[PDB]
Design a protein around this ligand. Structure first.
Ligand SMILES: N[C@@H](CCC(=O)N[C@@H](CS)C(=O)NCC(=O)O)C(=O)O
Ligand SMILES: N[C@@H](CCC(=O)N[C@@H](CS)C(=O)NCC(=O)O)C(=O)O
Lengths: 202, 202
């Protein structure tokens, strides 16, 4: 199996972590999807990472689909419950976390445009999406919808999203008055799979 | 059940069509997610439509998750196969179609920014994503991975994506030398569910 990705993408990281947790052997194929010359299109016409390539040449995308493919392999530890509705509820929370990643990425890409081309309004509305979403996550933990010791596809995705926010310096107050969220991501960050997949920083 | 949406969004339209096809009663709650004052955040902290609200107050997002929720209700006609791997393969194709919508939407939002803030490079790379993706879709139909008479979640999504491209006047050559794709979407557009969900045009 090949995982086509970048070293910074949290969508990719989510999958690297699933595979590492499950002890599944894979080769990483590094790509830079925002350069003009890159090699992503042979794997995904959308030009986005991650992509998973099976040992028959089938290319899987986007990241939630790949995570389900991996789950279907049936290798411990399970990262989704077996019950269809509860699995879908975990995957709704994964979609929330993926949306935090999306908003972080939009923010970073906005700031990569030439100065005169940037929209401060765009930055503000992405930041608001992030804060509202972090509030919903804290609420799940207050309510017991999530627990701080939960390790599943949703919580992996949440910690990847927060790790990305930190890395890119988006929403520096993510931890302010969200103490359950802090505990949850610290618990995940302590795992070897997170330690081995940190984004490179100069 | 409530479907929170806009009248133009193809992500929303995909779900309106599923519900209509299945004869499932719902109320539509219209929202404008790009205005500064809107009502989407009470349903989804990401501030995006669609959202599905159940008759207990649970809010489901994003669109692929909602489509699976609907499928889980087990109401004819089925829009996903029962086998887990083949269902996931249909959902991979749905992800491709959703990515075409994404690229179309990025294009439209780019063109909504003030003139001096626009990136022609951004427009070009979204257009290329679209063309490459349309080529993959045509290839699926040549290979028999899809058929022109296939009616499932993936092909609904494909026709919603193409309908959006047409509506927004993105990728006007989508039909050029993609005759299977043309036939597939014309077959879907002929259905009442598509006729009743067309985007408003002045
Ligand atoms: N919906 C996709 C989003 C993936 C995504 O946005 N990946 C970024 C890197 S973090 C990418 O490849 N961007 C290139 C582009 O948008 O052209 C998923 O969940 O995998
Ligand atoms: N991943 C989402 C994407 C939904 C989406 O992009 N919806 C657009 C309307 S077509 C939206 O609500 N945009 C508001 C925003 O991005 O702030 C899905 O599949 O539902």
């Amino acid at each position: 199996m090949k995982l086509v990705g970048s070293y910074t993408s949290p969508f990719v990281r989510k999958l690297s972590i699933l595979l590492l947790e499950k002890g599944i052997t894979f080769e990483f194929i590094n790509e830079l999807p925002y350069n003009a010359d890159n090699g992503v299109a042979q794997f995904n016409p959308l030009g986005k990472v991650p992509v998973l390539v099976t040992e028959e040449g089938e290319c899987w995308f986007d990241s939630p689909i790949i995570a389900e493919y991996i789950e279907l392999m049936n290798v411990a530890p399970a990262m989704l419950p077996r019950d269809p509705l509860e699995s879908l509820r975990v995957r709704k929370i994964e979609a929330l976390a993926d949306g935090i990643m999306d908003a972080g990425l939009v923010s970073v890409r906005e700031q990569a445009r030439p100065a005169a081309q940037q929209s401060e309004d765009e930055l503000l509305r992405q930041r608001e999406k992030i804060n509202r979403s972090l509030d919903v996550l804290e609420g799940y933990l207050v309510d017991g919808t999530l627990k701080t010791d939960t390790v599943n596809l949703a919580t992996i995705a949440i910690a990847c999203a927060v790790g990305y926010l930190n890395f890119r310096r988006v929403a520096p107050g993510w931890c302010v008055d969200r103490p359950h969220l802090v505990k949850l991501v610290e618990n995940l960050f302590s795992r070897e799979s997170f330690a081995r997949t940190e984004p490179p920083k100069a």
